RNA sequence: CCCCCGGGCUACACGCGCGCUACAAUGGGCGGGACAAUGGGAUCCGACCCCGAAAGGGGAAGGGAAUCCCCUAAACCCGCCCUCAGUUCGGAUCGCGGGCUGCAACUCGCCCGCGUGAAGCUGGAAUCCCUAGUACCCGCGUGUCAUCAUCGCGCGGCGAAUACGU
């Protein structure tokens, strides 16, 4: 009843560790969101990973597919108010990078300050660069 | 035989274990996914933290009442990690405290004074005193120096 | 998970921490008796008194001196064990409670393993770790030397206590071992005269160098 | 037609506090209704009644 | 195709400001709630008279703290940078951005040789 | 009905002057008076820098203005009011009266 | 009858009240046998352990302390309790034992903080920024 | 000369000074239990109640301050998880969203939430401050202030080691 390597969506997580921390190997899930998801599913977040049933994995995958329908307020998700749909969503390993890339690319396209700074590889928000930020 | 005659941690434990029968005291919808103040980083690890918080608020109203919801915020606040900036003190959130106090009032353990916070009733005073009596009866065997009190 | 009989402890007789006696403790070194204070007390805590008077440190209990030596941060401007040890915010500095607890647990472990008096063991460790001969620069005619000089007992005590505490800190730096276990190991080894003790090693080294350049 | 020489009525900022004696702008002690500069206060303090008393 | 929060431009053009602020990201919303100044009102008058008939001249302004609205899409505005008026052709993806985000005030630095 | 009188000043001699005047005023007649009661002294502190420039080590002047405070209750009788209100107060003392 | 006594430490003030009873000692309404931490509990209880049961089993002491940190409060309470016991017993053997053990039980401590000075005023009077050009 | 409107002093291959955060167990996190002082306060401090997950929003007693407020400080104690690992160490950088001040937050402001998770494994030559409630460690007040403190000036909490010399 122990799986040394469990296969959650896309990612292989450790078994010897607790679930709330094993789920952090995925890109887009922190400890807090993992605790939220496990509490919504009805799983002990202190249980050793690998003691996970196919039913449990499936429920976790469905919640990740769409958490807001299973609870998960719209203020605890990485991408509230999507640019082209609204429809508060939570992106993971594959779509998160594409979202970052398309945001930066539309900035570069409209030729805005932040996009020019991204191109040049320089600080973007407000920093001073005389004494620090040296490679 | 009173609250002042036993430690606070053991008493909060034994009161959280007992506040579960009271049906007017239950966690709200947004409880399982929330932090206790900005000065924290991670959520509570215990799955029954609501009752512990309610018991602590109950005992605090007993001790220091009349007290409203801005000094309990100070008591429950703490020290935040601000990254590369130095550490500072910040207060906690008020919704937890409001809900706890309203539940306690609904159960009939506290009441509000017109202009000075809230106080415990005799019904609640009896609760604390009896739980403390049981705890002291259990303790005064481990430490016989408590019998004379 | 400390039991209550140890969390809420109440002493009856006047002993060190209410647990360990001194009237059976002996001292063989005829040079260290007048400076190893073994007066019966409960709290080995003096609130900074006895420091302004030149020879006031002899009125301080030896256990309090060990606590104050342990309440350190490590090696800051010199190297010990081959490294700097600068903690600077994870340090027990100006925190006597944690030192109290470290020494308490160390004495418990010592009592357990040896089944003797830990204060007796500490006294033996001091006597076996105190150096008798050192070096210094002395000038005559206008040139510089390196001579061999004796040492005073009030300084031997400081050397021994400092070395014990430093050995504990070394053994505890970045390792699963704890500060209390390290202190206990150091004290037992120094009492039993084993080369694996930092303090005994330093004593032997100093005495050798002095006998050499005398 | 004759109004392009007058300032604006500032309510906040360093341009809202001149010194009653000299006319400096930046450093104003501003404690207890003192609109004086740190240079003139140090010279007129005894006339106002302040002493050292250390 | 272009869609801002699931709305096309034809739809955005017939919504009220009280409805478009609900879509903006809270800073332009705060700005519009507090209100517009006379400078921005005059610029709006210019824009509206230009998009139909009367005004056939370049639209120049010193207003860099003005937010891009839907009824400006399709025009070209000249924004002051401190030295001159930079042209900016307003597109759809600009909606919700300040007008000064497209008129830089400095120059890209090309370093030389450190001296003595 | 009683009357309270508060005295504030920078000079202690003027305070003692007025207080002993009213004390005799109240002892000649037989009337109950409490005090004078001393209240905490209030200090206006101002620390500032000496140099008018930035060069040189930094040095600071610390100026202080002290204010001493006394309280008195007089029992508010007609004769007392009459023969109290007629006392020339030294200009370096502020005095305020009011009935409870 | 009743007796009241006082004790002082750095910014801490304690006042104790003693009478006849069974041997109850209370600091701020709570017993002394469960005071935390141990290093303050012992500080407070040293005088009672010195006097003995044959004196403490006939008295009830209540202490009210205010200001100046927990160790300072404990020391002030210790001083006040010692003074109250001595004044209640009117015995010289106890006073001599106290003076031998620690003369600061009855006598007080006369140490306050030194004002800070303007180089690094935040840190202390004798502490300043470095010079490592 | 002096008054408005926009920019800049905030631009960054680099050399240096003074600092903050760290490289973990002499600890990180969660939940409970304690304990200060100095100072300040009129369109100012604002208890108390109700909204909101948080930042914050709406009413509003009292106070011209020994009367009311800022103000139940942190380090510390108890229990549970982690056990020597670029980690439940560390936080840089960046995306989306929600807010407050202000006539105006792009250049160029502060706060909150969910994600992301860069160097850094105790540091060469050399150099600095400290003799008692002093140094190390911990956090609060005030000045600057519409909004903004890794700063200056001060306040307390815990609290040493060595030498009484040349
Ligand atoms: Zn001037």
In 3-state terms, what secondary structure has residue A99?
helix
B109, B123 contact by CB (below 8 A) = yes
d(CA G81, CA G105): 9
H or E stretch including B95? helix B95-107
Tokens of C147: 């001579």
| Measured distance CA(E4)–CA(E22) in Å, rounded | 12
Beta bridge pairs of residue F4 = F73, F98
Q: Which residues pair with F73 in a beta bridge?
A: F4, F34
E76-80 and E59-61 beta bridge pairing = parallel
C75 contacts C170 by C-beta, under 8 angstroms: no
Method: cryo-EM
Distance D12 CA to ligand 1 centre (A): 20
Distance, in Å, from the CA atom of A27 to the CA atom of A23, rounded to the nearest integer, reads 9
Structure tokens at A21: 């921390």
Classify residue C213 as exposed, middle or buried by CB count within 10 Å of its CB (0-12, 13-18, 19+). Answer: exposed
Return the SS3 of E42: helix
What is the CB neighbour count within 10 angstroms for residue C211? 10
- What residues contact residue B70 under an 8 Å CB cut-off, 6+ apart? B91, B94
Compute the C-alpha angle D35/D38/D42, nearest 5°. Answer: 105
What order do you get walking across the sheet with G30-31 strand by strand? Answer: G3-9, G12-20, G59-66, G25-27, G30-31
Nearest DNA or RNA nucleotide to A31 (CA to C1'): H88
Q: Which two tokens stand for residue C15?
A: 């002993």
Give the separation between CA G43 and CA G37, rounded to whole angstroms: 10
**Contact list, G46 vs chain C (CB under 8 Å):** 42-43
Q: Tokens in use for F36?
A: 């004078």
The residue behind tokens 């001296």 is: E115
> Nearest CA of chain D to the CA of F41: how many Å?
14
Contact predicate A64/A90, CB 8 Å = yes
As ranges, strand H nucleotides with an atom below 7 A of a protein CB are 2-8, 10-37, 39-41, 46-56, 61, 66, 70-81, 83-84, 88, 91-117, 121-124, 127-141, 143-146, 150-164
Beta strand C133-136 pairing with C147-150? antiparallel
User: CA of A128 and C1' of H10: distance in angstroms?
Assistant: 6
Q: Please give the helix or strand (H or E) that residue C136 lies within, else none.
A: strand C133-136
Spatial distance between the Cα atoms of C51 and C37, rounded to a whole number of angstroms: 15
Q: Are C110 and C189 in contact (CB under 8 A)?
A: no
Protein residue closest to H126, using CA and C1': G132
> Of B7, B16, B13, nearest to B142 (Cα)?
B7
**B18: phi then psi, degrees, rounded to nearest 5:** -100, -25
Q: How far apart are CA F4 and CA C148, in angstroms?
A: 83
Q: Which ranges constitute the DSSP H helices of E55-112? A: none
- Omega of the bond prior to D40 within 30 degrees of 0, cis? no
CA distance B35 to B76: 12
Of C167, C202, C158, C173, which is closest to residue C185 (Cα–Cα)? Answer: C167
CA–CA dist D27, D33 (Å, integer): 14
Resolution (A): 2.7
Residue B148, token pair as written in the block? 């004379």
Distance linking the first and last C-alpha atoms of chain C: 56
d(CA C175, CA B114) in angstroms, rounded, equals: 59
Axis crossing angle, helix G38-51 with helix C96-114, rounded to the nearest 10: 70
Measured in degrees and rounded to the nearest 5, phi and psi for residue G61 equal -110, 135
Q: Which residue in A43, A66, A63 sits closest to A53, CA to CA?
A: A43
Q: What is the dihedral of CA C93, C95, C99, C104, to 10 degrees?
A: -170
Which helix (H) or strand (E) segment is G62 a member of?
strand G59-66
Report d(CA F21, CA G117) in Å as an integer.
44
Which residues, at least 6 apart from E86, have a Cβ–Cβ distance to it below 8 Å? E78, E79, E80, E102, E103
User: How many Å apart are CA C122 and CA C67, to the nearest integer?
Assistant: 12
Q: What are phi and psi of F26, to 5 degrees?
A: -90, -15
Task: Check: CB of residue A38 under 8 Å from CB of residue A107.
Answer: no
H or E, element range at B89: strand B88-90
* Whether the Cβ atoms of residue C14 and residue C42 lie closer than 8 Å to each other: yes
Cis ω for the linkage preceding B66 (within 30 of 0) = yes
- Measured over the CA atoms of residue B59, residue B62, residue B67 and residue B71, the dihedral's sign is negative
F57 touches chain G (CB under 8 A): no
Listed in order, strand segments (DSSP E) in chain E are: 59-61, 76-80, 85-89
Residue E65: which of E90, E93, E39 has the closest Cα?
Answer: E39
Pick from C56, C58, C52, C55: which is nearest to C38 by CA? C58
Provide, in whole angstroms, the distance separating residue C179's CA from nucleotide H122's C1': 18
**CA D37 / ligand 1 centre spacing (Å):** 5
Tokens of B126: 């009896």
- For the record, the structure tokens of G89 come out as 């017993």
State how far the Cα of C105 lies from the Cα of D53, in Å rounded to an integer.
Answer: 53
Contact B34, B94 (CB under 8 A): no
Local structure of G15: helix, strand or coil: strand
Q: How far is CA B9 from CA B4, B59, B126, B135, G39, in A?
A: 12, 11, 19, 11, 20
Contact predicate E60/E50, CB 8 Å: no
Q: Integer distance in angstroms from the first to the last C-alpha of chain D?
A: 58
Pairing of strands G3-9, B78-80: unpaired
Q: Classify each residue of B45-63 as buried b or exposed e, where b means 16 or more C-beta atoms within 10 Å of its C-beta.
A: eeeebbbbbbbbbbbbbbe
How far apart CA G6 and CA A104 sit, in angstroms, is: 71
Residues of C in contact with B142 (CB under 8 A): 4-5, 8
CA angle in degrees (0–180, nearest 5) for C194-C199-C200: 40
Could you tell me the two tokens for B23? Answer: 């049906």
What is D1-54 written as a DSSP string?
---TT-----SSSGGG---SSS---S----SSS----HHHHHHHHHHHT-B---
Asked if residue C164 lies in contact with residue C183, where contact means CB atoms within 8 angstroms, the answer is: yes
Give rounded-to-5 percent helix, strand, coil for chain F. 25, 45, 30
G120: nt with nearest C1' to CA:
H152
How do beta strands C143-144 and E76-80 pair? unpaired
Dist. CA F75–CA F1, nearest whole Å? 7
The whole-number Å distance from E78's CA to H108's C1' is 22
Q: Is D19 annotated as a binding residue?
A: yes
**Comparing C-alpha atoms, which of B73, B69, B65, B50 is closest to residue B109?**
B65
Q: Has D39 been labeled as part of a binding site?
A: no
- Compute the half-sphere exposure of residue F75: CA atoms within 13 Å on the CB side of its CA: 15
| Residues 6+ positions from F91 with CB-CB distance below 8 Å | none
Bridging pattern class, strands E76-80 and E85-89: antiparallel
What's the CA gap between E25 and E98, in Å, rounded?
Answer: 12
Q: List, edge to edge, every strand of the sheet that includes E85-89.
A: E59-61, E76-80, E85-89
Q: Which residues pair with C182 in a beta bridge?
A: none
């Amino acid at each position: 009843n122990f799986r040394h390597i469990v296969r959650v969506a896309g990612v292989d997580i450790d078994g010897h560790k607790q679930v709330r921390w094993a789920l952090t190997g995925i890109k887009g899930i922190g400890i807090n969101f993992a605790t939220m998801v496990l509490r919504v599913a009805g799983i002990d977040p202190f249980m050793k990973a690998g003691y996970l049933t196919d039913e449990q994995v499936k429920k976790i995958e469905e919640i990740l597919a769409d958490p807001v329908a299973h609870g998960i307020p719209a203020w605890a998700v990485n991408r509230p108010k999507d640019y082209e749909t609204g429809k508060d969503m939570h992106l993971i390993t594959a779509k998160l990078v594409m979202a970052w890339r398309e945001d930066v690319n539309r900035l570069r396209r409209i030729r805005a300050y932040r996009g020019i700074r991204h191109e040049l590889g320089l600080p973007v928000r407000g920093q001073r660069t005389r004494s620090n930020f040296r490679h | 035989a009173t609250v002042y005659d036993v430690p606070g941690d053991l008493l909060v434990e034994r009161v959280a274990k007992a506040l579960k029968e009271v049906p007017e005291i239950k966690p709200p919808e947004w409880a399982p996914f929330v932090k206790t103040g900005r000065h924290k980083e991670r959520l509570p690890e215990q799955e029954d933290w609501w009752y512990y918080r309610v018991a602590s608020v109950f005992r605090k109203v007993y001790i220091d009442g009349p007290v409203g919801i801005e000094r309990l915020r100070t008591w429950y606040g703490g020290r935040k990690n601000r990254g590369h900036a130095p550490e500072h003190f910040y207060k906690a959130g008020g919704s937890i405290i409001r809900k706890a106090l309203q539940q306690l009032e609904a159960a009939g353990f506290v009441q509000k004074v017109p202009g000075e916070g809230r106080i415990v009733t005799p019904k609640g005073q009896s609760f604390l005193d009896k739980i403390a009596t049981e705890l002291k009866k259990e303790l005064e065997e481990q430490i016989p120096e408590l019998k004379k009190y | 998970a400390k039991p209550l009989t140890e969390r809420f402890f109440i002493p009856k007789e006047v002993k060190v921490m209410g647990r360990w006696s001194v009237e059976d403790v002996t001292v063989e070194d005829p040079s260290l008796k007048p400076y190893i204070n073994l007066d019966a007390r409960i709290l080995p805590h003096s609130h900074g008194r006895y420091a302004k008077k030149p020879f006031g440190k002899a009125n301080v209990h030896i256990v309090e001196r060990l606590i104050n030596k342990v309440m350190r941060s490590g090696a800051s401007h010199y190297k010990a064990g081959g490294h700097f040890m600068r903690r600077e915010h994870r340090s027990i500095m100006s925190k006597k409670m944690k030192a109290y607890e470290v020494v308490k647990e160390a004495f418990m472990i010592i009592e357990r393993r040896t089944k003797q008096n830990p204060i007796q063991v500490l006294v033996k460790a001091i006597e076996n770790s105190a150096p008798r001969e050192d070096t210094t620069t002395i000038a005559f005619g206008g040139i510089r030397y390196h001579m061999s000089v004796d040492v005073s007992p009030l300084r031997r005590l400081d050397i021994a206590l400092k070395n014990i505490a430093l050995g504990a800190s070394i053994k505890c730096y970045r390792n699963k071992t704890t500060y209390a276990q390290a202190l206990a190991e150091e004290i037992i080894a120094a009492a039993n005269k084993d080369p694996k003790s930092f303090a005994y090693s330093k004593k032997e080294e100093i005495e050798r160098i002095a006998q050499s350049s005398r | 037609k004759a109004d392009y020489n007058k300032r604006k009525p500032r309510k906040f900022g360093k341009g809202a506090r001149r010194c009653m004696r000299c006319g400096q702008y930046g450093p104003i002690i501003r404690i207890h209704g003192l609109m004086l500069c740190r240079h003139c206060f140090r010279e007129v303090a005894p006339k106002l009644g302040f002493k050292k008393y250390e | 195709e272009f869609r801002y929060r699931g709305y096309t431009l034809d739809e955005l053009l017939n919504m009220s400001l009280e409805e478009f602020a609900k879509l903006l990201p809270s800073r332009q919303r705060r700005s519009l709630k507090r209100g517009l100044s006379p400078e921005q009102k005059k610029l709006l008058r210019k824009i509206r008279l230009a998009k139909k008939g009367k005004y056939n001249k370049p639209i120049r302004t010193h207003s860099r703290d003005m937010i891009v609205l839907p009824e400006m899409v399709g025009m070209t505005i000249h924004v002051y940078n401190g030295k001159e008026f930079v042209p900016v052709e307003i597109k759809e993806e600009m909606i919700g951005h300040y007008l000064g985000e497209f008129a830089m005030t400095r120059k890209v630095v090309q370093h030389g040789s450190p001296g003595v | 009905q009683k009357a309270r009188i508060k005295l504030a000043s920078t000079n202690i001699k003027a305070l003692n002057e007025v207080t002993d005047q009213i004390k005799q005023i109240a002892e000649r007649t037989g009337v109950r008076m409490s005090g004078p009661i001393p209240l905490p002294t209030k200090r206006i502190r101002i620390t500032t820098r000496k140099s008018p420039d930035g060069e040189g080590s930094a040095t600071f002047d610390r100026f202080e203005l002290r204010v001493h405070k006394r309280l008195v209750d007089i029992e508010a009788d007609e004769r007392a009011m009459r023969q109290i209100m007629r006392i020339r107060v030294p200009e370096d003392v502020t005095i305020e009266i009011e009935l409870i | 009858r009743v007796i009241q006594t006082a004790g002082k430490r750095k910014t801490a003030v304690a006042r104790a009240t003693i009478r006849e009873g069974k041997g109850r000692v209370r600091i701020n309404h709570k017993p002394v046998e469960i005071i935390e931490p141990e290093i303050a509990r012992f500080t407070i209880m040293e005088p009672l352990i010195l006097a003995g049961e044959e004196i403490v089993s006939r008295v009830d002491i209540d202490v009210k302390v205010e200001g100046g940190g927990f160790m300072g409060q404990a020391e002030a309470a210790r001083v006040a309790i010692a003074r109250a016991l001595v004044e209640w017993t009117n015995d010289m053997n106890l006073k001599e034992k106290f003076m031998k053990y620690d003369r600061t039980m009855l006598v007080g401590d006369s140490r306050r903080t030194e004002p800070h000075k303007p180089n690094r005023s935040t840190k202390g009077p004798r502490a300043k920024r470095q010079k490592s050009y």
